[PDB]
Amino acid sequence: MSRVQLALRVPDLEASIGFYSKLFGTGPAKVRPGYANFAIAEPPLKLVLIEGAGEDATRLDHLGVEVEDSAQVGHAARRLKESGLATVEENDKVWVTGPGGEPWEVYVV
Ligand SMILES: [Co+2]
Ligand code: NA
Ligand code: NA
């Protein structure tokens, strides 16, 4: 259906991969320099780890909703705009930002 994407900026990518592998009982789906992600079935979650630049603590990088196909992104894009939110589309993604600055992407992988 759809799942939340949580992207964390972490000070230690390697330590974070080990921790999350244990927490969710599954290994990362993608690993490359400075980046890893996990595709978790239960709870439905795309977890993204971005290595920080000498960061002192983990912080939120961005948030999102991962959907099945482009049509769903388009539907979300139109609904969000009609609701009065300012949006930015990529062509597939739509971006909105919350009042305290937290960015959300609605996207298809
Ligand atoms: Co993302
Ligand atoms: Na979810
Ligand atoms: Na934060």
What are the C-alpha distances in Å from 74 to residues 67, 85, 97? 10, 15, 18
List own/partner pairs for 87-92 with CB under 8 A and 24 or more apart.
none
Give residue for tokens 């795309």. 46
Resolution of this deposited model, Å: 1.5
Q: In sequence order, what are the beta bridge partners of 10? A: 51
**Structural domains in the chain plus CATH codes:** 1-109 (3.10.180.10)
- Which ligand places an atom closest to the C-alpha of 41? 2
Q: In sequence order, what are the beta bridge partners of 8? A: 49, 60
Contact residues for 35 (Cβ-Cβ < 8 A; gap 6+): 13, 48, 49, 50, 51
Classify the phi-psi angles of 56: left when phi > 0, otherwise alpha if psi is within -120 to 50, otherwise beta. Answer: alpha
Q: How many angstroms is it from 44 CA to the middle of ligand 2?
A: 4
End-to-end CA distance of the chain: 13
- Which ligand places an atom closest to the C-alpha of 62? 1
Judged by DSSP in three states, 100 sits in: coil
Classify the phi-psi angles of 61: left when phi > 0, otherwise alpha if psi is within -120 to 50, otherwise beta. Answer: alpha
Phi and psi, residue 41, nearest 5° = -80, -40
Torsion of CA 54, 60, 39, 16, to 10 degrees: 30
H or E element, residue 82: helix 70-82
Q: Is 75 annotated as a binding residue?
A: no
Q: How many angstroms is it from 21 CA to the middle of ligand 1?
A: 19
Q: How far is CA 60 from the centre of its chain?
A: 10
Q: How far is CA 105 from the centre of its chain?
A: 7
Q: Is 5 annotated as a binding residue?
A: yes
Q: How many angstroms is it from 102 CA to the middle of ligand 3?
A: 9
Judged by DSSP in three states, 79 sits in: helix
**Closest to 40 (Cα-Cα) out of 81, 76, 6:** 6
Q: How many angstroms is it from 68 CA to the middle of ligand 1?
A: 15
